[PDB]
Amino acid sequence: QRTPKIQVYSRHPAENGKSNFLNCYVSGFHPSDIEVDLLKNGERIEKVEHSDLSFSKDWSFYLLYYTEFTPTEKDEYACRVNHVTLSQPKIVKWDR
Amino acid sequence: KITQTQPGMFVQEKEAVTLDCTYDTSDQSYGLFWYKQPSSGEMIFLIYQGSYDEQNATEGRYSLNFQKARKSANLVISASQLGDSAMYFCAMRRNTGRRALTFGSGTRLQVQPNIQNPDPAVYQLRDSKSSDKFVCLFTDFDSQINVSQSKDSDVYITDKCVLDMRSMDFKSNSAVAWSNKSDFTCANAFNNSIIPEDTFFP
Amino acid sequence: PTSFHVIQTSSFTNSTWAQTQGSGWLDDLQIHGWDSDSGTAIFLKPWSKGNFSDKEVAELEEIFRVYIFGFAREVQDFAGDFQMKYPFEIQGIAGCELHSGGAIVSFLRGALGGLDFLSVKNASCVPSPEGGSRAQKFCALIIQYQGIMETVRILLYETCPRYLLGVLNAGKADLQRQVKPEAWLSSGPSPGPGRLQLVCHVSGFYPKPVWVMWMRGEQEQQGTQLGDILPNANWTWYLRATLDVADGEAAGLSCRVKHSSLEGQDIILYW
Amino acid sequence: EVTQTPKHLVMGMTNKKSLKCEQHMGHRAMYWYKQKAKKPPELMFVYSYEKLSINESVPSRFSPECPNSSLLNLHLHALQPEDSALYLCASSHLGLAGGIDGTDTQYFGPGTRLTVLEDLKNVFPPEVAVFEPSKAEISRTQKATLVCLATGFYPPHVELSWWVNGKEVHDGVCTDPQPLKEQPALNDSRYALSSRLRVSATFWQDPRNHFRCQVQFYGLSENDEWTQDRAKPVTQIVSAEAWG
Ligand SMILES: CCCCCCCCCCCCCCC[C@@H](O)[C@@H](CCCCCCCCCCCCCC)C(=O)OC[C@H]1O[C@H](O[C@H]2O[C@H](CO)[C@@H](O)[C@H](O)[C@H]2O)[C@H](O)[C@@H](O)[C@@H]1O
Ligand SMILES: *[C@@H]1O[C@H](CO)[C@@H](O)[C@H](O)[C@H]1NC(C)=O
Ligand SMILES: *[C@@H]1O[C@H](CO)[C@@H](O)[C@H](O)[C@H]1NC(C)=O
Ligand SMILES: *[C@@H]1O[C@H](CO)[C@@H](O)[C@H](O)[C@H]1NC(C)=O
């Protein structure tokens, strides 16, 4: 049992009115069952895509969920992860 | 691919016949199978030899001549009986292959009986109901002589078929021929095929 | 160093429910995806086939398809004897690595519940002690099946090196390209009064190795934490280097980035 | 052993039929083979763990299906005349269950002689007759040779058998392995088959012995569509008798 570690970031520096990629990378968790959502201001961005399942030399999995977006000054982006090792879902807010 | 390179083999009864099968796969670690298909159609497994078994697999009357270096494994049947007349296939399965059998072209085997006292003759058989219809039979001839189909497209001539009786332990080749042409008589039915000179006629 | 390996993850929930996923990776770029529903292989790159012919590609695909179909059923069959407790997970990774100097080394490793179970060297049992008693038991049974061991050895020491060389030569253009790294600077709320954090983000670079340092002129300033090199879609990498410092000393500081794609033209970001 | 009902099948270009192959040894993998005339069997489908693992470019008319782990059907509909051949079902062990010996031998079943037809008018029932032995034979060889002749049947799917005194026999009976075409160089030629029985002269000379050549013909099923004044060529038994 290993609690996932979550890191969120953007492929390009935070501009306003500029297309960019928002990534949420979850690492070092076990077992493989996990649910990850990307949250814009609380509602769920349903246009997220994820890479295939992989694991490191410790047999601890890791995934990334990345999506197109266009940051503004009012919006709010975060990553919500729920997994067996966590009793309540954990939210990690993207920083700028 | 597996090349049998054999049209068809003939062998007397109570002898040994070496059916050939040469494959061209350069990969090691495979499995060689032999399958027999009688006239009925069903495929009957015969013998199996692993590539690494370092020993010519023998099972019943079927032996093997597996030579890995020469890429050939000729099945050997010892003391062939009349029941060994069938299609023979040489299939091969590879460790990293198709996971299913791959058959060669196959080789017909026609074991023939040893006729002790040949007595070739042609007998005219009369129908049970209508005497006008009739067919006549060429029988009790030697194993070596073959019978060929007539050049005419109306005269019907069957194939040399070996008939065996377990009561008095008798085996005898025979062939039957009939036609609807009025002029057709087996005074000259088998005129196309070679016939023994002393063939008795009625 | 350029270790092409396929990986498999199987999750068993109940006596008749089990899922299986698989994928083949070059180093960390996914090359082969696997649709386990229809049991087909998806080639995610133009050079995913290497120099292999399509016929041997089909042969390998069918071998993997049969193995994927049967693994769950066989594990379910033997779980009664092995005293598996449901649910559980079985992971496997097998492939070949090209060491520097042209010495290809093949490897296979398995794990249950996140703990090492077994490995092969010279096509033989190596039951990892973490797997414990059952581990040995299992591989002992596995020793009996000569055909399975022969297939494993053939795929490991005879086919994997050929495939690895094929893809390394074929995918030469994509493997050895260079992309300049973007870089920028940001502030960070650090613990302690009169304190601050400086974050130098470097993104979009390839290949993976890179040297990023928070330096005051050429003083070679220490206290720079380099976070793990996070991946990024489009097949580049991202990395933030953080430095903690009290307010006032921010002047005279700059993050310096050295990467192969810059051919000695280092990136300097002043703060 | 493997059962592969039905053993014979005659089909049109619009009918839908099914082929059932069933084995109770519970192997694992099942196969479908198709063998043409005087050709090695060719693989069609492979089912591993009740999942289709190999499809050798078989057209979409064939619809295989593996409901149980000990069953493998094959549904056909709207076939074509070239699709007439012998269809064999095969079974074999797979890994971790066949034991130490990883031979994975394949066990075949009695194939199904599927002959499809674009015109149902061609199917005919055989006409059989029995020819009594000649006086020349019994005089010299002291043996009698009954000859049965089944002519004019199509498709060539018949099973000839001899019955002496109401009892099926297997001693001193021979039959041509393959039927002989009646009008060669024609794709719709009717077929003729022959068989011979040899017995002692005394046996034939008894006036209280019954010889019956019985031909089992596999033709049209009862539910097929017949629109001809001729009797519907259903599968039937045609026999001819003889007395001493
Ligand atoms: C090109 C990419 C490079 C990546 C390389 C990846 C390295 C490792 C890959 C190994 C994957 C597994 C391969 C074997 C699985 C199939 O081949 C097998 C299907 C059934 C498997 C179900 C149970 C699996 C248990 C775990 C196995 C691995 C554990 C690791 C141990 C440490 C299969 O193919 O079985 C079919 C038959 O194969 C052989 O039979 C074949 O060979 C013999 C003679 O050699 C012939 O007689 C046969 O005709 C031929 O089919 C086996 O002998 C037989 O038992 C199998 O039934
Ligand atoms: C047995 O196999 C070996 C291996 O090639 C061969 O040299 C030898 O002739 C075989 N023996 C017989 C009797 O065929
Ligand atoms: C008869 O057929 C056999 C088998 O092909 C052949 O070896 C033999 O030479 C033939 N004899 C004659 C007279 O045609
Ligand atoms: C096999 O492949 C052919 C190729 O077109 C396809 O038409 C057919 O439906 C396939 N059969 C099955 C059972 O998937």
Residue numbers in the entry:
A (entry chain B): 4 to 99
B (entry chain D): 3 to 30, 36 to 59, 62 to 68, 74 to 110, 112 to 217
C (entry chain A): 7 to 277
D (entry chain E): 3 to 29, 37 to 58, 63 to 72, 74 to 81, 83 to 111, 111A, 111B, 112C, ...
Paper text:
Here, we identified that trehalose monomycolate (TMM), an abundant mycobacterial adjuvant, activated human T cells bearing a unique αβ T cell receptor (αβTCR). This recognition was restricted by CD1b, a monomorphic antigen-presenting molecule conserved in primates but not mice. A cryo-electron microscopy study of CD1b-TMM-TCR complexes revealed unique antigen recognition by conserved features of TCRs, positively charged CDR3α, and long CDR3β regions.
Recombinant CD1b was refolded with synthetic TMM and incubated with soluble Y-50 TCRαβ. In the area between TCRαβ and CD1b, we observed a clear density map that exactly overlapped with the chemical structure of TMM. TMM lipid chains were buried inside CD1b pockets, like GMM, with its sugar head group exposed toward the TCR. TCRαβ tightly contacted with its protruding bulky trehalose moiety through CDR3 regions. R114 of the TCRα chain formed a hydrogen bond with the β-hydroxy group of TMM, likely explaining both the strong effects of alanine mutation and the altered recognition of TMM lacking the β-hydroxy group. Another critical cationic residue, TCRα R107, formed a hydrogen bond with the hydroxy group at the C-2′ atom of the distal glucose in trehalose, whereas the proximal glucose interacted with TCRβ D114 through the hydroxy group at the C-4 atom. A positively charged R37 in CDR1β formed a salt bridge with a negatively charged D83 of CD1b. CDR2β also interacted with the CD1b α1 helix through a salt bridge (E63-R79) and a hydrogen bond (Y58-E80). Thus, the TRBV4-1-encoded TCR Vβ loops interact with a triply charged patch on CD1b defined as a 79RExxD83 sequence in an antigen-independent manner. Furthermore, long CDR3β region uniquely found in TMM-specific TCRβ and its demonstrated compression in the ternary structure show how the TCRβ chain moves upward to accommodate the bulky TMM head group presented by CD1b.
